[PDB]
């Protein structure tokens, strides 16, 4: 079968092949939730194929694990649903029973490591259990900052930069183009609330102002829209249309945005800059709504593209199946081909990290490995210590368990003759700087940079007066005669001229006349 490959040591693989934001978490008639009826997602199957390709390479390459077969067992975890049972299935002692003990130092679990879930909530839920056994867990796409507390999650490591760096990239991009007045949309779930709070803090500290924050309804493309949801979407898009802000930052699952963008199309809306968060920045499905060309320009945050060799051709016990996955991926294969492996590198590096850590744990030379029983805590102990080059990049684990990889800002392109996600800038998390911004193309008449700002910059001799709550909004008022704006000291008030000098209106100088 596709989801299982025997070996001497086994890796547990968790990916979300099917998803539904309103899925049932509890048992149905005392049978474990079955995900086949939820919507299939192409990119999750792509990442699962990435794991399988990585293990194929490791089994072929005798230089890394000579004579040791590396196997895997993969289970579908469907957003929240089916969180619990796969963990017990990984931990059980080969007859699906897990004994309760006061000590697990000598307990041989069925898998030695878990390539963990893609969702923050699933990651935390699984880590709660795997923390007891100290079974090493590596997650490739869960960005929430909560995961940095290793007293809280000792067993957990990541191969993608934390949410802080995503927010930093967005903020520095907005600063570079000197935007000042932005809209924020969130999807009424914990991902949206997390990232919205973090963005609020950073933006407030950096002098940009969030003009507007709003929550989307949790609509679904297969489901018919109710009148109330329609009214809500109408309200949201009307609010945006009548407002002056045109930078729109969207934190949402891709499933939620289909109806939102359709409604935006109904409203004849145009002219925005859509800052797409990682959760949808590279979705093939949304990209194929070719009418989006008229809604402005789309810039997304993602992890740096690294071209994996050979993986392009490779892409050509309940809840271990997917029927529609291959039929779905077959259609998008061309678009996927053009899009350089991005998150695929996170999965690839996770598997290679476990491979190297196991290779070191066995003390293995590149001739033979002295096979022995491996207990997960020792493999975690060795995983913390690896440092090696992988495909012209390099991975080693920080004190917080993260790995440093370049972030990338990408513009959506619709020509279909070349890469649909063009690189336009790159953010280095070690330097905490956005770097090497290239030629973005704009919807504007002559590619002059668009902007949205609360108030235009005042003329010389005009002091500020705050308009309201936001520091970013100010009226301009000329200084009165006999007073001047000492711009080197203050911006909000005009100072009086010396007792022997005077000034005109809207003047910074003083002169010796009555």
């Amino acid at each position: 079968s596709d989801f299982y490959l025997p070996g001497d040591y086994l890796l547990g693989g968790l990916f979300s092949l099917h998803a539904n934001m309103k899925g049932i978490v509890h048992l149905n008639f005392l049978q474990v939730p079955m995900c086949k009826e939820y919507e299939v997602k192409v990119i999750g199957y792509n990442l699962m194929q990435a794991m399988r390709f990585a293990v194929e390479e490791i089994n072929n390459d005798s230089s890394l694990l000579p004579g040791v077969l590396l196997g895997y067992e993969i289970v579908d975890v469907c957003y929240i649903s089916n969180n619990v049972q796969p963990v017990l299935y990984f931990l059980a002692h080969e007859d699906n029973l897990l004994p309760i003990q006061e000590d697990y130092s000598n307990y041989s679990s069925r898998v030695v490591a878990v390539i963990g879930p893609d969702n923050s909530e699933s990651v935390m839920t699984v880590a709660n259990f795997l923390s007891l056994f100290l079974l090493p867990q590596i997650t490739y796409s869960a960005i929430s900052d909560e995961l940095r507390d290793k007293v809280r999650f000792p067993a957990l490591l990541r191969t993608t930069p934390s949410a802080d760096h995503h927010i930093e990239a967005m903020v520095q991009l907005m600063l570079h183009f000197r935007w000042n007045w932005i809209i924020v949309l969130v999807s009424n779930d914990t991902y949206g609330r997390d990232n919205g709070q973090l963005l609020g803090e950073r933006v407030a500290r950096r002098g940009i102002c969030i003009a507007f924050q709003e929550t989307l309804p949790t609509l679904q493309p297969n489901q018919n829209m109710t009148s109330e949801e329609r009214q809500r979407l109408v309200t949201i898009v009307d609010k945006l249309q009548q407002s002056t802000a045109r930078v729109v930052v969207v934190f949402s699952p891709d499933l939620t945005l289909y109806h939102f963008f359709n409604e935006v199309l109904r409203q004849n809306f145009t002219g925005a800059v859509w800052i797409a968060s990682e959760s949808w920045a590279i979705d093939p499905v949304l990209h194929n709504l070719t009418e989006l060309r008229h809604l402005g320009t789309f810039l997304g945050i993602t992890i740096q593209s690294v071209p994996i060799p050979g993986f392009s051709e490779f892409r050509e016990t309940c809840n271990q199946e997917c029927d529609n996955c291959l039929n779905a991926t077959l259609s998008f294969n061309t678009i996927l081909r053009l899009s350089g492996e991005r998150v695929v590198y996170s999965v690839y590096s996770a598997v290679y990290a476990v491979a190297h850590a196991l290779h070191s744990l066995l003390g293995c030379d590149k001739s033979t490995c002295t096979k022995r029983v491996v207990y997960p805590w020792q493999l975690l102990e060795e995983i913390w210590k690896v440092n090696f080059t992988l495909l012209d990049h390099q991975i080693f684990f920080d004190p917080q368990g993260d790995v440093a990889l370049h972030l990338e800002i990408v513009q959506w392109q619709w020509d279909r003759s070349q890469n649909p996600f063009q690189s336009v800038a790159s953010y280095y998390p070690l330097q905490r700087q956005l770097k090497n911004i290239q030629d973005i193309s704009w919807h504007t008449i002559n590619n002059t940079i668009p902007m949205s700002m609360c108030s235009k910059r005042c003329q010389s001799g005009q002091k500020k007066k705050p308009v309201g709550i936001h520091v970013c909004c100010f009226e301009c008022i000329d200084c009165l005669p006999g007073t001047f704006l000492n711009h080197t000291e203050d911006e909000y008030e005009c100072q009086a001229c010396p007792n022997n000098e005077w000034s005109y209106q809207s003047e910074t100088s003083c002169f010796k006349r009555q």
Partner: protein, 514 residues
């Protein structure tokens, strides 16, 4: 004593229980390197008192012929040590197979049977959610004597959770009722930067908007001082006389230590249960100078016989013959002098009620005739859960009722710190049960004249007045007068329009004249 040995006894049906019997030492916050549970040697009295309350409740349920006639009810208590790592091990142990020490990973459970019927849940909210995922996946009843966290109301994610204490929303709606009934439509809100306070601020902000209460300022204070200085500075800048402080005890102590450092200005503080009842904050000197402190506390009956019960059992627990009848260390060394301070603790009732509710729910599920239950195969947890959603049960008197939300209908008393000497006397000045009854003449304010202190804003103005918004949600206006020599051309607009050189008008005028 021989008292740890009493934390278990047999029965035809078994109740599991989680309490903070022990705690970690500060040096005991060890970084684990082998997978074994932290050994929480350090004792804590509150947990033991709650466990004794559970023992008393089960003893009564066995004694009464009116409930579960012909069956013996047993219990099995475990320490949580207030951490997920420790709490999760007995959580797994509870759901192990009947008559065995193993947990099973089957894909269907139609005739599976765990060793416990239901679990008396943990006290703190973090443990409540962590164990709620697990227990609600299996559809096992969980009944918590604490965990006011509002997030637990969600039946999409916590189907089987119940509690015998009101959730945060009841207290916050009572606070909104207080503000509305006293007429304080202009306030500031502060919370502790933990999930408790950070969720409370969201709930209260939405409620305040719904009832027309305007929030001048929002902020969070850290738990263990730049942000504290910033928060109090902004509060003073906001020109507000009423401040809500929905903060954990340590955060409140930090903020009021800063206030002790300098009492910048006095204000009416709306407290929360935790601060309102915790000694280390109540002991701070001269707090009458802060302004009056108000807050709502829920009222339930005492366990009148409980102190005599504890006296009796701590006397009995050392008889050399009775000892013939170590999950908690140091439990066996305790003496009544270290326990006495907590014998009157209000939360014991919530433990007692919980047990009774479960017992009642079982009695209904078995359909027991009062003279004896009918013969049946063992009741499974998911059978009991179906009956428990619509359950009315007496607790000594005062019959309570669960509903679909899993909460109980319970009423609140408005407590005022009437300061006398260095001691605040807790004075009742009203009740809330969904509507607020206030005995206003009894409260004496901090302001010398003992008239009601004023914290309000306008939302209406003669049309000749400006409309510049203020407040965190722009829910207030300034009403500044339109200038003489100008006319108010636009209703509800900001500006006014000026008149000719020979053209004159009053202030607030809509017209000008020759």
């Amino acid at each position: 004593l021989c008292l740890s040995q009493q934390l278990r006894m047999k029965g035809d049906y078994v109740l599991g229980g989680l309490f903070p019997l022990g705690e970690a030492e500060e040096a005991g916050l060890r970084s684990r390197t082998r997978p074994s549970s932290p050994v929480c040697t350090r004792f804590s009295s509150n947990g033991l008192l709650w466990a004794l309350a559970m023992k008393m409740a089960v003893e009564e349920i066995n004694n009464k012929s009116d409930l579960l006639p012909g069956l013996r009810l047993g219990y099995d208590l475990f320490d949580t040590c207030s951490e997920p790592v420790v709490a999760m091990k007995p959580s797994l142990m509870f759901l192990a197979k009947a008559g065995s020490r193993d947990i099973a990973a089957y894909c269907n459970y139609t005739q599976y049977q765990p060793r416990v019927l239901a679990v008396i849940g943990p006290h703190s909210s973090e443990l409540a959610m962590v164990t709620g995922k697990f227990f609600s996946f299996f559809l096992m009843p969980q009944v918590s004597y604490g965990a006011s966290m509002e997030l637990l109301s969600a039946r999409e994610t916590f189907p089987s959770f119940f509690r015998t204490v009101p959730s945060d929303r009841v207290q916050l709606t009572a606070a909104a009722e207080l503000l509305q009934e006293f007429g304080w439509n202009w306030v500031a809100a502060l919370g502790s930067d933990d999930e408790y306070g950070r969720q409370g601020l969201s709930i209260f902000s939405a409620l305040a908007a719904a009832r027309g209460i305007c929030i001048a300022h929002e902020g969070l204070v850290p738990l263990p001082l730049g942000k504290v200085q910033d928060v109090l500075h902004q509060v003073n800048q906001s020109s507000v006389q009423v401040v809500l402080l929905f903060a954990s005890v340590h955060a409140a102590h930090a903020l009021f230590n800063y206030s002790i450092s300098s009492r910048l200005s006095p204000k009416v503080w709306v407290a929360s249960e935790a601060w309102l009842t915790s000694d280390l904050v109540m002991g701070l000197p001269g707090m009458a100078q802060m302004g009056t402190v108000l807050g709502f506390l829920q009222r339930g009956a005492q366990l009148h016989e409980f102190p005599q019960y504890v006296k009796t059992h701590l006397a009995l627990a050392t008889d050399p013959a009775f000892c013939s009848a170590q999950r908690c260390p140091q439990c066996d060394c305790i003496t009544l002098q270290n326990v006495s301070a907590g014998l009157n603790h209000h939360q014991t009732f919530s433990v007692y009620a919980a047990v009774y509710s479960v017992a009642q729910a079982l009695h209904n599920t078995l359909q027991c005739n009062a003279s004896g239950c009918p013969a049946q195969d063992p009741v499974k947890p998911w059978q009991l859960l179906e009956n428990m959603y619509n359950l009315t049960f007496h607790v000594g008197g005062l019959p309570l009722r669960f509903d679909s939300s899993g909460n109980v209908d319970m009423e609140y008393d408005l407590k005022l710190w009437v300061w006398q000497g260095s001691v605040p006397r807790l004075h009742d000045v009203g009740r809330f049960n969904g509507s607020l009854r206030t005995e206003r003449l009894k409260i004496r304010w901090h302001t010398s004249d003992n008239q009601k202190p004023v914290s309000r804003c306008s939302r209406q103005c003669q049309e000749g007045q400006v409309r510049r918004v203020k407040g965190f949600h722009s829910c207030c206006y300034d009403c500044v007068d339109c200038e003489a020599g100008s006319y108010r051309q636009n209703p509800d607009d900001i500006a006014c329009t000026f008149c000719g050189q020979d053209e004159w008008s009053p202030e607030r005028s809509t017209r000008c004249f020759r």
